[PDB]
């Protein structure tokens, strides 16, 4: 037969997972769920390769058995669970709170965050659709369906969801002053103010983004996540602050020590 494949070879795994060639033949195929396998990491490599809490898959299972870890403040016990582009992880035994972000090299890193910070989730709406009775639902990058969204919300907006109740708090638009984070390209992880939105009829609409240092980079509109307005980002960013530095002069900061 030719049903769905259920194995993932290590060298076939996504590169940002950082699975060593010599450390086994297979990679943990993430279970289906909120995020795509390509743009998410499983909990096995979240608690085994990044936090180094576990030394093995069985240890990851031992962690998950005790209902300690929560993803979007609800208990998750699946080892191959997609974490996602941006979302909160709570380790209750060790009290600590993470948000999955991209570093400027496009790799998923758990950003330490505070308990008060760990109630806001930025969800990028992807589809707005009205069902029976003219009720409007927004399907977000996370994969949730939020009904009775505000009519002002558009397709590429972002919403600040309250984790415990799943309700929108405020929405952010996509003006040329709105700061965004890039999601999958060469410039994955950068944060910038949107230079402009070059819209072309029938193909990918391109958007140009200004870094903090006035460096312009363009990207496909699908690879953009509005993170704040022109004042400040609505989330704490990882230590790089979403600024990508030229390889030639990153060496200068590496050498100075």
């Amino acid at each position: 037969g030719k049903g769905i494949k259920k194995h993932l070879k290590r060298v076939n795994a996504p590169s940002h997972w950082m699975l060593n060639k010599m450390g086994g033949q297979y990679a943990p195929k993430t279970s289906s769920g909120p995020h795509k396998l390509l743009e998410s990491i499983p909990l096995v490599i979240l608690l085994r390769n990044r936090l180094k809490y576990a030394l093995t898959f069985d240890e990851v299972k031992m962690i998950l058995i005790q209902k300690i870890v929560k993803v979007d403040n609800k208990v998750r016990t699946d080892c191959t669970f997609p974490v996602g582009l941006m979302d909160v992880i709570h380790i209750t035994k060790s009290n600590e709170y993470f948000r999955l972000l991209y570093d400027i090299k496009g790799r998923f890193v758990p950003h330490r965050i505070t308990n008060e910070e760990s109630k806001y989730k930025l969800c990028k709406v992807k589809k707005i659709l009205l069902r029976k009775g003219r009720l409007s639902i927004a399907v977000t990058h996370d994969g949730r369906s939020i009904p009775y969204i505000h009519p002002d919300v558009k397709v590429n907006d972002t919403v600040r969801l309250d984790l415990e109740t799943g309700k929108v708090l405020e929405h952010l638009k996509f003006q040329v002053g709105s700061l965004v984070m890039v999601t999958a390209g060469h410039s994955v992880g950068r944060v910038g103010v949107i230079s402009s939105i070059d819209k072309n009829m029938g193909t990918y609409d391109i958007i140009h983004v200004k870094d903090s240092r006035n460096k312009v980079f363009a990207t496909r509109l699908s690879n953009v996540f509005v993170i704040g307005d022109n004042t400040k980002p609505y989330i704490s960013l990882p230590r790089e602050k979403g600024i990508k530095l030229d390889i030639i002069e990153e060496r200068r900061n590496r050498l100075k020590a």
């Binding site: 809490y53 069985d58 240890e59 962690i63 300690i68 035994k93």
Partner: protein, 120 residues
């Protein structure tokens, strides 16, 4: 029999109630030191009233002697040791004894005893 226990990359893991780290065994010009001595030393350095709550593994003596790298795991208690350690590591530490090593002949017997071919 004196040495130096250089503990590196130490972190606390309440999730397994353990403490991860790696060891450097500075024992210049003298043979590799047995594991009981380093167990005793680690208990002394971390104020532990016992010795059986810790597991040492992955010991390599490096080239030219006088050094050894390994990994250690403290545990909150022996109950945590038994809960979070595999059978082979418990047998290494001597906490239990090795289970019967009949091995892969059970795989033969399992399907030799096709169900309802054996009334039992």
């Amino acid at each position: 029999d004196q040495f130096t226990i250089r503990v590196k990359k130490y972190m606390s893991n309440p999730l397994l109630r353990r403490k991860q780290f790696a060891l450097e065994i500075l024992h210049p010009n003298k043979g590799s030191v047995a594991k009981k001595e380093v167990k005793e030393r680690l208990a002394k350095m971390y104020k532990l009233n016992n010795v059986n709550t810790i597991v040492l593994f992955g010991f390599k003596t490096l080239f030219g002697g006088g050094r050894t790298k390994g990994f250690g795991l403290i545990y909150k208690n022996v109950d945590a040791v038994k809960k979070f350690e595999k059978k082979y590591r418990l047998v290494r530490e001597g906490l239990i004894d090795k289970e019967t090593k009949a091995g892969r002949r059970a795989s033969k017997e399992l399907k030799n005893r096709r169900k309802k071919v054996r009334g039992t």
